[PDB]
Amino acid sequence: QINQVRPKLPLLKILHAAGAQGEMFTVKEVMHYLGQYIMVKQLYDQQEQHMVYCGGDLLGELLGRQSFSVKDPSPLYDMLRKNLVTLAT
Numbered sequence: 001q002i003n004q005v006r007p008k009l010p011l012l013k014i015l016h017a018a019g020a021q022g023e024m025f026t027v028k029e030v031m032h033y034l035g036q037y038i039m040v041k042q043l044y045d046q047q048e049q050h051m052v053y054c055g056g057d058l059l060g061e062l063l064g065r066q067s068f069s070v071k072d073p074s075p076l077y078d079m080l081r082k083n084l085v086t087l088a089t
């Protein structure tokens with residue numbers, strides 16, 4: 001397969017809910033479909049769209065945690081490091 005990620009059926013479903021084709025592409029493409037997933041699913045605080053709260057969502061099940069932010073994106077890179085060697089923060 002390609003030198004990037006791809007999911008299984010129940011995880012492909014999550015990026016399909018954001019109009020994608022699973023995680024079946026590079027870091028920059030997954031984070032694009034994930035940004036629009038959070039924007040549709042509206043899993044954020046009213047006073048701060050920057051802070052994400054995934055309580056009981058398939059995205060919280062996918063990442064293994066029910067919160068992250070656009071200032072602390074390390075939960076994405078912990079998802080990616082398991083597939084390919086890449087950057088983190």
Ligand SMILES: COc1ccc(C2=N[C@@H](c3cccc(Cl)c3)[C@@H](c3ccc(Cl)cc3)N2C(=O)N2CCNC(=O)C2)c(OC(C)C)c1
Pocket residue numbers: 031032034035036038039044048049050051052069070071073076
């Ligand atoms: C003050 O609150 C904000 C501020 C900014 C965004 C933001 N910033 C990007 C981004 C680019 C590069 C790196 C990062 Cl870490 C974030 C990207 C996004 C991509 C991936 C993820 Cl996982 C989440 C969000 N992102 C974004 O999708 N939007 C969509 C709406 N309009 C925009 O201009 C920004 C925002 O997004 C919500 C969806 C959380 C809300």
